[PDB]
Design a protein around this ligand. Structure first.
Ligand SMILES: NS(=O)(=O)c1ccc(O)c(NC(=O)NCCc2ccccn2)c1
Ligand SMILES: [Zn+2]
Length: 257
């Protein structure tokens, strides 16, 4: 089974998921001087006021907060998108040290972590159908750097000790994901893929230029999670990121100058 170790990590994934070598894989390095400003791109519309968080889960590859996606409660619209995308979950990728952890890079710079807010296109009715479509998902990616604390992350950090090992979950209601967003919604966008198996080429990526800052204490709590299940040899959940993949026949567009 796939993971992030020497014998099951990203360089092995293509054996079970041959699309790993496909034409629109993620993440990628964002070369800021080569991204082209597109004046036709609209502002992103992030409408999270009615979000209903449900549960937080350690799935053995990250921790995920899930939302009620049975109605248009927390939706992403505008930007490069046509139609309405419902928020299903968010999760993070992070490093063993502050100089690595992000999936996307910016002029080869790696951030300490990366937040993925995962949304699916309501025209396909459910996320399983959306993953089989080239415009099925929109993932809003937000970089994390280490410095000052992010107060809106603290409720997440404080429950992680209850989901230490793979398969554990907890009720996580009334969490407001607006507390995770930076000031600016300036973004880069490109067509890509899921960054974990099945690596489906179904994602419009929207990566925010402005990182959020989190404290060293907050990221240390991420690094105390375990990849293993309870009772198995402890392997800290760190470095759960896929490296940048070939850009191939794609242009990254910027919403800003
Ligand atoms: N990391 S990401 O590109 O935001 C992203 C977003 C939504 C997703 O469903 C995934 N992939 C994911 O959750 N995979 C779960 C594990 C799995 C599911 C199906 C087959 C093999 N492995 C990644
Ligand atoms: Zn992700």
């Amino acid at each position: 089974h796939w993971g992030y170790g020497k014998h099951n990590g990203p360089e092995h994934w293509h054996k079970d998921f041959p699309i790993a070598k496909g034409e629109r894989q993620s993440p990628v390095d964002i070369d800021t001087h080569t991204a082209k400003y597109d004046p036709s791109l609209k502002p992103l519309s992030v409408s999270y006021d009615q979000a209903t968080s449900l549960r937080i889960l350690n799935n053995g590859h990250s921790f995920q907060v899930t939302f009620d996606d049975s109605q248009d409660k927390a939706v992403l619209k505008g930007g490069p998108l046509d139609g309405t995308y419902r928020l299903l979950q968010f999760h993070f990728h992070w490093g063993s040290l502050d100089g690595q952890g992000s999936e996307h890079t910016v002029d080869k710079k790696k951030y300490a972590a990366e937040l993925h807010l995962v949304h699916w296109n309501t025209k396909y009715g459910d996320v399983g159908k959306a993953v089989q479509q080239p415009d099925g998902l929109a993932v809003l990616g937000i970089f994390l750097k280490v410095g000052s604390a992010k107060p809106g992350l603290q409720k997440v950090v404080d429950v992680l000790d209850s989901i230490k090992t793979e398969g554990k979950s907890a009720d996580f209601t009334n969490f407001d994901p607006r507390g995770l967003l930076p000031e600016s919604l300036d973004y880069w966008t490109y067509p890509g893929s899921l960054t974990t198996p099945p690596l489906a080429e179904c994602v419009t990526w929207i990566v925010l230029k402005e990182p959020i800052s989190v404290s060293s204490e907050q990221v240390l709590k991420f690094r105390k999670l375990n990849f293993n299940g309870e009772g198995e040899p402890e392997e800290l959940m760190v470095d759960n990121w896929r490296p940048a993949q070939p850009l191939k026949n794609r242009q990254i567009k910027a919403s800003f100058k």
